[PDB]
Each structure stands twice: as C-alpha cells, then as structure tokens.
Amino acid sequence: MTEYKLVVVGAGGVGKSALTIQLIQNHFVDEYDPTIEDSYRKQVVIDGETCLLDILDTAGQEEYSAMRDQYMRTGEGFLCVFAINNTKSFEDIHQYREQIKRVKDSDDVPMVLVGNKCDLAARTVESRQAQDLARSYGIPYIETSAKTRQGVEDAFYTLVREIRQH
Ligand SMILES: Nc1nc2c(ncn2[C@@H]2O[C@H](COP(=O)(O)OP(=O)(O)O)[C@@H](O)[C@H]2O)c(=O)[nH]1
Numbered sequence: 001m002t003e004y005k006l007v008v009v010g011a012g013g014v015g016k017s018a019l020t021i022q023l024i025q026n027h028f029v030d031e032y033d034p035t036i037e038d039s040y041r042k043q044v045v046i047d048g049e050t051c052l053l054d055i056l057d058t059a060g061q062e063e064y065s066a067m068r069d070q071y072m073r074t075g076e077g078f079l080c081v082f083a084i085n086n087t088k089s090f091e092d093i094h095q096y097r098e099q100i101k102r103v104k105d106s107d108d109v110p111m112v113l114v115g116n117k118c119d120l121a122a123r124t125v126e127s128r129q130a131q132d133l134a135r136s137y138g139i140p141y142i143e144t145s146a147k148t149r150q151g152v153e154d155a156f157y158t159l160v161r162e163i164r165q166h
C-alpha cells in the first residue's frame with residue numbers, strides 16, 4: 001500500500017472541499033464550514049492496487065500561515081482547482097503555480113490544473129483559455145463538478161499517475 005498526498009490548492013469557493021468530501025462521505029455539500037482545516041484521507045483502488053491517498057483540503061484562515069506552506073513541501077500531488085464559472089480562480093492558479101516552485105525550489109512537481117464547476121452553461125472560461133495556460137506550463141488540464149462527480153475521477157486518477165511515472 002503506497003501513500004500519496006493530494007496537495008490541493010485553489011480559490012476559496014471553486015469547490016475544493018465539496019470535491020474531497022464527495023469522494024469520502026459521498027454527497028453534495030453546499031456549506032462544509034470554510035472555517036475548518038483538517039486532513040481527509042481515503043482508501044481506494046486506482047487500477048488493481050489500493051493506495052492510501054492523504055487528501056489535503058486547505059481552508060480559509062488568514063493571518064500567519066506556516067502549516068499550509070509546510071504542506072507545499074511535504075505533499076507532492078498539486079490539484080490546482082480553478083472554477084471556470086468564476087474567473088478569479090484562473091488568476092489564482094497563475095500565482096499559486098509559483099509558490100509551489102518556491103517551497104520545493106524547483107519546477108518539476110506532478111502538477112494538475114483542474115477546472116471545477118463544469119456542470120453549468122455559464123462558461124466564463126473557455127476551454128481554449130485553460131488550454132493555453134496549462135499547456136504552456138506543460139501540465140494536464142481536466143474538468144470537475146462536485147454537483148455530480150463529473151470529472152472527479154479523471155482528476156484524482158491522473159494525479160496518482162503523474163506521481164508514479166515521476
Ligand atoms: N453548481 C455547482 N456549484 C458548486 C460546485 N462546487 C461548489 N459549488 C458552489 O460553490 C460554493 C462553495 O462550495 P464549497 O465546496 O463549500 O466551497 P469550497 O470549500 O471553497 O470549495 C457553494 O455554495 C456551491 O453552491 C459544483 O461542482 N457545482
């Protein structure tokens with residue numbers, strides 16, 4: 001049984017928590033108390049090999065924050081969540097994809113830019129924009145929607161596949 005860390009990072013509201021709890025409790029949550037920071041684990045099987053995945057769903061909390069930075073150095077999988085129907089999450093992934101290079105002090109993490117909130121018609125972020133920003137860094141782009149587990153499997157799976165190959 002291997003152990004991988006899903007270092008999640010994105011805008012506060014894209015649906016990072018609702019995505020984690022979904023794979024765990026299995027239910028759409030509209031308010032999972034944004035004022036809560038804890039590590040959510042999950043034992044599942046990727047492809048004939050069970051592997052404990054310590055999901056790291058950071059929360060809000062302002063002021064001093066040294067535990068979130070320490071996790072950026074310990075975990076390895078980076079699920080850069082970005083709500084396509086928000087736009088601010090996109091600008092949040094631009095800078096969020098620099099501090100990761102700070103912590104590890106290098107540009108070679110199994111990075112993964114996911115676009116949450118892709119189960120609606122209001123598409124403020126066209127796929128061409130996320131394709132020109134993610135493809136530029138050389139990172140895979142996927143879709144996700146906690147409102148129906150749509151894409152949640154393509155993100156978590158492709159994440160363990162990037163850490164294994166590395
Ligand atoms: N339609 C839709 N709304 C979502 C989705 N994920 C989050 N939201 C909305 O965004 C808000 C924040 O969700 P939540 O996951 O609790 O916040 P987070 O912890 O910052 O991700 C909620 O009020 C939801 O209505 C999703 O997959 N689909």
Ligand SMILES: [Mg+2]
Pocket residue numbers: 017032033034035058059060
């Ligand atoms: Mg939250």
